[PDB]
Design a protein around this ligand. Structure first.
Ligand SMILES: C[C@@H](O)CC[C@@H](C)O
Ligand SMILES: C[C@@H](O)CC[C@@H](C)O
Ligand SMILES: C[C@@H](O)CC[C@@H](C)O
Ligand SMILES: C[C@@H](O)CC[C@@H](C)O
Ligand SMILES: C[C@@H](O)CC[C@@H](C)O
Ligand SMILES: C[C@@H](O)CC[C@@H](C)O
Ligand SMILES: C[C@@H](O)CC[C@@H](C)O
Ligand SMILES: C[C@@H](O)CC[C@@H](C)O
Ligand SMILES: [Cl-]
Ligand SMILES: [Cl-]
Ligand SMILES: [Cl-]
Ligand SMILES: [Cl-]
Ligand SMILES: [Cl-]
Ligand SMILES: [Cl-]
Ligand SMILES: [Cl-]
Ligand SMILES: [Cl-]
Lengths: 202, 202, 202, 202, 202, 202, 202, 202
């Protein structure tokens, strides 16, 4: 009938694909403020659950620009695959080697742009039998129309569309595993929730 | 072949998941006015057809805050499961125990937020063979994008996307079962329909 | 494999469901000017191809109000089923009686509201094996969210989502079948196309 | 399982359907500036990868108007099928004859309007076993609602929804195949990317 | 130099103009739920400060329909001027007599539609030297464009554009005048504020 | 002090400026359906109050195209000034001669595009001491941004921003002058008001 | 004659009015992410130019909640006026005393909500001859409509409408006064500008 | 007391302020495609009427980036003022010297961003008695809210808000001055108008 394949913190890896200084100016389907916070939220979550994290860039020594400094600072030890040519990250042998080295079946992916640098390796990974979870609000593209088309194409392939908050909650399962630690993530990336915490504290 | 598995007032139960004072401030994909009306509309419908109703909250003794007073006031005998830790309500044994105690195969679900507190138990219930009917306009989340992603994930699982008005009409089937009572629900939650009623009365 | 099941002018019937004066004030996902034009466009198309047309209303002697005068004036010989109680038109035996009396397998349907008076008989007709074509822009509801949920529910059942222009074009197949007649329909319901015709005529 | 059926520059043909001067005034779901740029972007891409290109128009000696001069100028040797009557291009034998003469199984299609001149031959081609790739941002129609319905109908048939940028990247595979040539396309149709290039050049 | 002409609860009167069941179906620049709540909010405020209130309708014995029952129920002794013909309420001598009988210099006005039934008497009252305060969110019309044009016309005439919340706060001046009474109004018409109250109460 | 300079049916003239078949394809800040209805509504009002009407076009024997047939058909005896070159209609001596020949102090103006063919003669007429009333929803332009700028420029000049409905009501003053005649206009151009009339008639 | 009265870093004071945990949940005309960034942006600017800063709250010991911790952390020596009752901060004698103690004629103001806690003291300050500069994107309210009404009221009174970025640039005047220092503010609150900086640095 | 001060091609100069590769990535209130077309349209117009043109940049040897090559290409003899520090271009003595050297009192201004690099010299120039005409659609900024605040501030100072099309038409006055030359500009920057020309040409 149906199988609920939900995120497991022991079976998941996170992929940050081409969050580069140049490419980010192409993102117009999210505001710069929301998009920065959403990506950093996913990064905090990846760091909080000690998930194997993989960083990759496309043509970073050109107009595409360098990876945002936050990602390198937060994951200084993570596999960093600079792709000089391959647009689909899965066409890069070093990238795929790094993914399989994690030993994780679940791939949490976010990047720029959604319709290409996210969609292409998502479709490729799905073909190889990976369970792919797309962080839709940490992935950006030219406009809502292009985004919706990318969703349709990935949905049809069996990708699970989610967001950083749902990713965090599905990984955490139970508040009591770490109340303050998890609460700090929510408070740090949901200003309305930070307000609830502060009011509750008085 | 396709089977129109529609709501039966003798086979349906209603689940209100985490409509709490704090969490409601996170809902931005509906205006506070429309969302309040939609939730209360579903509640009136649940009470009107005497459907087994289950109330549940998440970490209500924290920033998430208490359940809205209207729900506790309207359903004083309904099972009330306060979940101290489990984010997915289906991971709470008392919640599932209460759901199965109703003996209903059809689950009408609404809550906050859509992508988590609604989506997770929906996927879990669908996995167990339940027919899940999602009240999309009585469920709120951070923004339309997160909402649309939640829809995609629930749709792929076989969840039926509906709304409080369609839920009521599918339950009621025939106007003549109770013209005044059902009309009062419509008039009380559709101001435009209330206007039609008043004009017709003159 | 996929089969292009397209509209045939010898096998299609049109269903106008509850386009009533009162209920139309509930429609907010289309502007009153656009919605009136779209419905009348579908009507002109139904009449142009001499398609079997069925008119039905819900509780017309109440706040729901009478059928819009245009539909009755254009189809004075069409079966007119006033449903006193059944919300789903397919639960009315006389309505179903009229549909099957046409001998048409393809059902072109439009009405108010989309999530109920269109969705419910669409799902019912799909269950009995009918090919149902929904005229999405001649069907109205409370808001875009409710509409999108209704689309999702009908889509999963196998309904084909279309619009009055595509319905007309799929029925007509070839311009040369009636250049003057078909062009008059397009010009009469697409002001931009009327402008092209006038400019071309000088 | 799932198969990533991606565009191959050796197995793909591009179809420009009815981008005519008159019909373009019907397109309102894209701004005239963006739509012009998107169509021309797709054209540059088709020429860059030397893809078999087919131009077709509908009733061009009438109000529909002539094909835009750019398409005829850029593809002077491409098959040009002026369709006298058939609205669905696949109902035109000369058009289908030209498509099959390319020997390409992958069809990249764009045109006006989306719900008819794109949707109909897309569904027809899918029926014959072609892999159809729809350039959603190079296809225009009356409004977003009509667009979404067309997407739903084509998605249900197995069409792959894409955009000119993703189409180009999936065709190109690797930057190093032609850095200057491919970069010139991006800069020429993404003003933001042109800005990245100029800043990088200083 | 500038003079802050702010609302004074001893020098202000409230005018409810043509909030009738029929005319309300014309209001599309606000949703039915938000508009009802806003109008009732202004009514609660008017009653709370015991402000001289005037009710008026236009051609109520026709399609325009009766005044909403809430307004008559809340102000049973307030002057009720049924205007059989005059569109501008200020052209009705009984209406003007009632306005001046209050002896108030400040006129708080709301109604349907904004561009006519609000704008016209606003401009007329400003001409006679009244200080007119427009409750913009308790006044509805066909669309945002019509709204903005009406604002511009009233702005140029010297009308002060406000909303029910700002009207309430400017009248109240100080919380300590009546904390419970005023808080009940806010909580009863701001679902977000009611939630703050409930969380604070636990 | 402020003076309410309202429309008088004995002191007003209507100016239709460049509502031509070609130029109308430039109008994108209104949908083709609503814009057609609004212009025809203004036309009906001008004819209903027997107001001196002036029709003018710009370079009609070129791409701009002919005046829409409805306007000439409704006003066959009205002054028709085809402007060969002058973009500002007020720079055309025949146009100004016709305006002053009406002997009317109040100028009701609508046209295409708003920022030019409406704005320029509006400012010119305001300079000559005319009272100018702009029908904003019967005037179209490229986009909302351009429209708002045109509003700002005309507002600063002392132009009164209105719409066809408010224009009609300010001219009519009292329903009882002609209930049936005026009601027919409203019903004929407000699809929702037509519905109110039909329900009231039952 | 017009005088450009622009911000002077030696003659300006900054007012933060009621940016409280509870009241912030009422702000819906900005996303929580952009709004938090904008307020913190203004705070960094106030600190960067060492401007006299004044913090004030309204009924902080109730549902309104405490001031956001960032403001208190950044301005430990700033005047902190807790207003127990007065809604208009200018009706509070300690607040006005603190404002006049700065000796600054130019008031940069931001707060929650715009139509009340910002508008009221703005109008009051303008009455006392102060030059008031409104930071529109660091001020929040219920919805865009209420915001625009507040703008109209403050504009008509002579307030200068601005935003944190324009405020900063007008204070800074010249880049060379502190290139690195000012650039850090821009980079820290404009993610798009931070990207330009990083790309430029490689 | 109103004087229509319209653009004169013998008394006007054009100012392009900081249209730089870096700063353009900050513009989000216009799409990259529309904004590029709008700026280039203004440039073509400036060149067409041989208007004195002044180019200026802000900190171009930094993240702000170089001036777009098109402006530099079209005006190789125009005064080029690179401002190393002054944010307000009017604070640069070389810029003001160049403006006054043209001998033009009417200033046509466009740039990035609207609220700063356009607003500041606009306000300064108005102070010195210049007539300033703002090309609103050739000026970009962070978002519509920031845009509108800038409009309000410039409007209050007496700036005339326009757009490139209206600017061109007000300069051209009469079509017959140069039919083909002016028509080529319109056709080259209005795709909908280009379509009219092509259809008319057949
Ligand atoms: C916490 C967030 O909602 C606001 C914090 C800013 C205003 O300092
Ligand atoms: C929308 C309509 O029900 C308004 C109701 C009054 C009470 O505000
Ligand atoms: C009680 C109200 O403020 C919250 C809205 C709930 C009823 O959905
Ligand atoms: C065909 C239509 O766009 C013209 C009729 C209206 C503009 O008067
Ligand atoms: C008469 C009008 O208000 C209804 C619109 C269409 C459905 O007839
Ligand atoms: C710098 C900003 O544009 C993006 C930074 C986030 C994506 O880590
Ligand atoms: C490059 C693009 O973003 C705008 C600049 C034009 C004017 O060249
Ligand atoms: C819109 C037209 O004028 C330009 C041609 C584009 C569609 O290639
Ligand atoms: Cl590579
Ligand atoms: Cl639990
Ligand atoms: Cl029945
Ligand atoms: Cl053919
Ligand atoms: Cl009267
Ligand atoms: Cl002329
Ligand atoms: Cl106080
Ligand atoms: Cl300088």
């Amino acid at each position: 009938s149906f199988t609920y394949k939900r995120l497991d913190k022991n079976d998941a890896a996170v992929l940050f694909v081409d969050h580069q200084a140049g490419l980010l100016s192409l993102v117009r389907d999210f505001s710069p403020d929301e998009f920065k916070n959403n990506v950093l939220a996913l990064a905090d979550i990846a760091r909080f659950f000690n998930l194997p994290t993989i960083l990759t860039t496309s043509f970073e020594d050109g107009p595409n620009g360098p990876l945002v400094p936050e990602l390198k600072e937060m994951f200084p030890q993570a596999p960093y695959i600079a792709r000089p040519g391959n647009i689909n990250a899965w066409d890069n042998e070093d990238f795929v080697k790094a993914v399989k080295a994690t030993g994780k079946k679940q791939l949490i992916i976010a990047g720029v742009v959604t319709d290409v640098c996210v969609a292409f390796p998502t479709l490729s990974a799905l073909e190889e039998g990976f369970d792919v979870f797309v962080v839709t609000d940490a992935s950006g593209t030219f406009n809502p129309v292009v985004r919706d088309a990318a969703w349709a194409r990935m949905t049809a392939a069996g990708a699970q569309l989610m967001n950083w908050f749902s990713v965090g909650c599905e990984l955490h399962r139970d508040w009591r595993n770490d109340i303050e630690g998890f609460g700090a993530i929510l408070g740090g990336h949901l200003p309305a929730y930070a307000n609830l915490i502060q009011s509750f504290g008085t």
